[PDB]
Amino acid sequence: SVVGGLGGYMLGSAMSRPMIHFGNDWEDRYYRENMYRYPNQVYYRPVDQYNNQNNFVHDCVNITIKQHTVTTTTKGENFTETDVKMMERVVEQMCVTQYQKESQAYYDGRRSS
């Protein structure tokens, strides 16, 4: 797929795509049925330019949303805020799990000790 809008984001490591407990049985299935649609990797930036944890993990995930939506559209498709909501919740914790490396690689910089 050709995102285009990724010229300085990079691709994470792939990982085990976590399930979620939405608390409600129709949403449990909604994700785990549609799960094949959802991205197996996340997109990110050097946390060297960031400061807040939150703001990075935000942009990380939300770029990983618009990567996936906009490289699905351009041919008579769109997402819905549901499939987005499900992806956000999963791609967040995935984005943390990849981030925790980028984060240590960052703190290793700073002056090394």
Residue 96 is encoded by which pair of tokens?
């943390």
Taking the domains of the chain in order of start, what are their residue ranges? 1-113
CA dist., res. 65 & res. 71, Å (int): 10
Technique behind the model: NMR
User: Dihedrals φ, ψ of 44, to 5°?
Assistant: -155, 175
User: Which residue reads 């094949």 in tokens?
Assistant: 36
Q: Which fold has domain 1-113?
A: Major Prion Protein (1.10.790)
> Coil, strand or helix: which one is 46?
coil
Neighbours of 46 (CB within 10 A): 13
Helix axes 81-107, 25-34, angle to 10 degrees: 70
- DSSP code per residue over 84-105: HHHHHHHHHHHHHHHHHHHHHH
> CA-based angle 59:25:58, to the nearest 5?
5
